[model samples]
Target: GFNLKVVLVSFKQCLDEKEEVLLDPYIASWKGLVRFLNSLGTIFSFISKDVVSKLRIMERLRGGPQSEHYRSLQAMVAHELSNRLVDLERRSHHPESGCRTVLRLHRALHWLQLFLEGLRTSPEDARTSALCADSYNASLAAYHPWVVRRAVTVAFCTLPTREVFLEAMNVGPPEQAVQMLGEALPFIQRVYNVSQKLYAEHSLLDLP
Candidate 1:
């Protein structure tokens, strides 16, 4: 994921210079995000199993027929919507459509945004468990059931301290890790905002 640096690289590259969101780098950022959590503890496998599956779904879209339509998030949404490739009501529709697949990653990106921002600003004594749990509750809570959310909160307990967590990023000093997060989180925000705006516009927020 950047470890913090490579993670930073893809996020900074995820969005087009302005409005367009390129699928190449957007998917790259998701890869790094998933990897970042994975590095912390393989315990995150509960989450990554789903995230990685979605990533592969997206990667296929980029490599499949009319992959050009998926070149950017903007195009994929329009193509899927205009052409009815989107399964607006039921998963029985074209479930593999880019709009729905990327939506999964969009949700993941939101969790990364909150979690990383906490990392950037919190003091050294902060608990990685609280940060992860807080980010999940804030970003993904509404989407999952009670037990699913509770399970993750329990898993967060295995997370290391903020210092240990930052060190695992392998990015030199803890101070520098914070600096990298500060430098990189803005791009994550921008990428998330743009995708959210698109999904909101298309009413794809609740796609099955």
Candidate 2:
């Protein structure tokens, strides 16, 4: 039922393989997120659309002639940083470096991690809307414009109930979903942590 687990498994495999550049895993994870967003209904299309667009950018970079250089996050950083493809202080140049694009997704990943964690620990009757809003407020809201935040929060309020959300995951009962999250979220957290450190080391965290 819950095909989401398959996506989680793919992410885990990427980690286990010690893949250097996370471009592929990053895209795959977001594709799963798109599916999850879809289950919530069309009202969240704005959020998903933005995410998908970013994923598409990454995908193109990964499939481009420089694809070899983007084999890992570490590789891309080393390549781009060496070639001066990144706009360290200002995004006046190399606006499309893999580092910058991935950084955006990396930030979003933090929000997703926090949101899913909140859902994992939340009581069954707890409101998904509140959980999602709190997660956004604590994480992504800091980076977003006021108008965007307002739009996202309003969209959050339209979320399906916790039960329906869990059911949409197709992961079995709510209890089982929580169990799966406990197993799956650490992988996401680890990936985010690694990517966060990589970007921080390269000072690309604020890539325009």
lDDT on C-alpha atoms for all candidate structures: 0.82, 0.77
Residue 132 of model 2 has an lDDT of 87
Candidate 2 lDDT, tens digit per residue, 1-208? 5466666656664453663545676687778877887666665555677778878887898899999788788888898889888888777877767788888777777777887788888888678888888888987688889998898888777666777766666889988888888888887777777778888887777777
Model 2: lDDT equals: 0.77
Candidate that scores best on TM-score: 1
- Candidate 2: the clashing residue pairs are 2-170, 20-72, 20-73, 21-72, 21-73
The TM-score, computed over Cα atoms with residue i paired to residue i, of candidate 1 is 0.92
Clashes (candidate 2): 5
Name the lDDT value of residue 124 in candidate 2: 80
Q: Across residues 47-94, which tens digit of lDDT does each residue of candidate 1 receive?
A: 777889988888888898889999999999888888888888889869
Q: RMSD to native for every prediction?
A: 1.8, 1.9
Candidate 1 worst ten-residue window by lDDT = 1-10
lDDT of 2 at 41: 65
